[PDB]
Assembly symmetry: C3
Homo-oligomer: 208 residues x 3
């Protein structure tokens, strides 16, 4: 009826899956545990990829600052660009020739930025503005199109959200069986699954 | 029993709603799809309105900086105020005479700020402090009371959270029917519904 | 069957709990309301503690800036350290001799920072670098080990997430009974429970 302990005549989501022995029950419990882990890693993983897309900020920081520059306040705009250029260079698609091309474009960006600052530190204004207009040639050349990284990330995240929703309902359905062994397997799988993929995000860098 | 394909003797949440024909099933599937979309737009919409309340920051940034000013470090405090004043002016209640009054108060704020900076750039300190004390007369006049925008937003968001919770349980109950056509309708409605209201937040500005 | 109004032969999650009188029903409704509140406060409380761990930022801000310092750009690095040192001092473990020791170490940090700035404002560079190397002796002495605050917070949050997951399933199971009085009790408990613990986070400081 209602929170029972059993390994007999217990159906599990699908007509083919029924468990009538203890050895079947452990296999059912192991799967419902693993599904409960998989879910927690899915939700946390899906967030981590969403936060990494930060790129959208850096990308807007660069392009917003170019219009801000295009009157010796330019140096502060370019120092904001340099910072944004370096965090943007670290970026990588989720698990190399396009990357090596992308990364090496950003080196040229950061170098050009330093040269435009070198004019602003000496005091030269109009010339530092002319150099910044050349900067937008470089981002078009290397960085702009590869935007691919951002589109890939959004789709991947849509695909994951669907799977996250299916699994949630599936875990509701196994809990709804009212079998205390399955229910506990889910609960324990939620606890430990969260703890582990929580720990792996702490292994990767932690800011904000 | 357990993930069946059917359009016969299928009850849907309410005693009055039962579906015994395929033409009824499509109507049931269309409603459970739409409910699954509506939910995803509700959760995303409810977040977007919560992030927009940013205003709370700008409002505290202004008032925190006034006490910080009230010793030539004032210029940096007022430049923080100016930025905060302009993002605060963009704000608008969720879907005009009070607004036009509110917006036009902020113009006067930003202008007064520039005049207090003009003293600080020349080097004049005590006079730039006296001008800032007049700034708090202006926010009281126009901005302060209209705080209404913030209270409206919090209540709206409470109202939405309730509806978000009802719908979630309702979608659990339709999935719990174990009818594979309804279950799929929800799952598909979660996928596409998320994708669309995800896309509309990308249509609106994207920072942080 | 399907959204019924009743106080007769209604079972509630456990074989021992069955309700056959109206006076039992109110007790069931009060418990399912309270569980619905408790859940909302759990989710919001669990977030508030996660945001407070901010400390991780300040802690990395200090240690990142020390390597940045160890060429008169040091003053801006130390002013970032001072800010980070003061928000870090406000911190406290969730509900005093270790604290008084921890807080008083941070005073010494902020004072040492001011002295290193006093050299940078006069123009002295190499000496301001030598003072910063002494700063890392002080954090080791007082702050570093008490990291305990951070580890305590992560475990507490793991413990809460488990309980949050159990309660969610439990509230699904009471809603699944299809008793309109229990269902409403949950829905109302979600509405009001959210509103209150939403209001208490607004009582505590609100930034970002
Ligand atoms: Zn979770
Ligand atoms: Zn979703
Ligand atoms: Zn909620």
């Amino acid at each position: 009826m209602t929170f029972y302990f059993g390994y007999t005549n217990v159906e599990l989501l699908f007509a083919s899956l029924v468990i009538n022995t203890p050895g079947e029950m452990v296999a059912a419990c192991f799967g419902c545990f693993l599904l409960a882990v998989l879910y927690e890693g899915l939700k946390i993983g899906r967030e981590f990829l969403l936060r990494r897309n930060d790129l959208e900020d850096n990308w807007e920081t660069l392009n917003d600052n170019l219009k801000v520059i295009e009157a010796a306040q330019v140096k502060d705009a370019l120092t904001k660009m340099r910072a944004a250029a370096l965090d943007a260079q670290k970026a990588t698609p989720p698990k190399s020739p396009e990357m090596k091309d992308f990364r090496h474009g950003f080196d040229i960006l950061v170098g050009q930025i330093d040269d435009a600052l070198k004019l602003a530190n000496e005091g030269k204004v109009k010339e530092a503005q002319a150099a910044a207009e050349q900067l937008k040639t470089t981002r078009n050349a290397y960085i702009q199109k590869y935007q691919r990284m951002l589109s890939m990330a959004h789709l991947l995240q849509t695909v994951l959200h669907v799977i996250q929703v299916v699994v949630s309902y599936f875990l509701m359905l196994v809990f709804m069986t009212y079998n205390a062994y399955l229910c506990m397997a889910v609960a324990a799988g939620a606890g430990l699954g969260y703890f582990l993929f929580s720990w792996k995000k702490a292994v990767v860098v932690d800011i904000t």
